[PDB]
Amino acid sequence: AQYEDGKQYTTLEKPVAGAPQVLEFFSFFCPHCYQFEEVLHISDNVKKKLPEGVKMTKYHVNFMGGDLGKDLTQAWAVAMALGVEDKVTVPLFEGVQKTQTIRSASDIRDVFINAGIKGEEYDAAWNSFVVKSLVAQQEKAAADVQLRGVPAMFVNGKYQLNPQGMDTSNMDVFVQQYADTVKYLSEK
């Protein structure tokens, strides 16, 4: 074929029922995630190719960056609840990996503060149980695919994008190839 298992994707031996249709995993410590985010714009180019009715979920993971890593997953929960993903993603990435100015939960908070979220509003959300469950979800979803590496994308809980079977000569062609694969798996 042109798309075969073990090539542009892999199949999960243990398929995850009722999973979000298009599901992405990342870490703000994850170097490829960084390049996935602000040089490749993967999530975004995948949206521009997905069908009618399809929903995209993005979750942080804990297993990079240790104690900060966890704070970052809770902080992403806050991002999701407050609907500010688009306003923190870049300064969070740049704060961990470019400038190294994020070293404590407090530095994470600053990003949100400087991005315009209100202190009391952030703290409230941070400490809220809607956020607790959102952290819980982020973790359960990862556990359900026994996830060990990021970036990762899962389609319909059944398939896993395998970027290392696509070519990296031209980045724009990588994106196109990646996104098209998602569209393929989506229709499967």
CATH code for the domain in which residue 38 is found: 3.40.30.10
| Nearest residue to 81 (alpha-carbon basis) of 39, 43, 137 | 137
Q: What residues make up the domain containing 10?
A: 1-188
User: Under a CB-based contact definition with an 8 Å cutoff, are residues 152 and 141 in contact?
Assistant: no
> What distance in Å separates the CA atoms of residue 9 and residue 179, rounded to the nearest whole number?
12
Q: What is the sign, positive or negative, of the torsion defined by CA atoms of 97, 99, 101, 105?
A: negative
Q: What is the sign, positive or negative, of the torsion defined by CA atoms of 54, 57, 58, 62?
A: negative
- Resolution value (Å, 1 decimal): 2.5
What is the number of alpha carbons within 13 Å of residue 171 lying toward its C-beta? 10
| Nearest residue to 60 (alpha-carbon basis) of 23, 91, 94, 86 | 23
DSSP state letters, the chain = --S-BTTTEEE-SS--TT--SEEEEE-TT-HHHHHHHHTS-HHHHHHTT--TT--EEEEE-SSSSHHHHHHHHHHHHHHHHHT-HHHHHHHHHIIIIIS----SHHHHHHHHHHTT--HHHHHHHHH-HHHHHHHHHHHHHHHHTT--SSSEEEETTTEEE-GGGS--SSHHHHHHHHHHHHHHHHT-
Method for this entry: X-ray
The backbone region for 156, taken as left when phi is positive above 0, alpha when psi lies in -120 to 50, beta otherwise, is left
126 φ, ψ to 5°?
A: -45, -45
**Tokens 């202190």 belong to residue:** 119
Output the six-digit token pair for 122. 């952030």
Output the six-digit token pair for 128. 């809220």
The domain total for the chain is 1
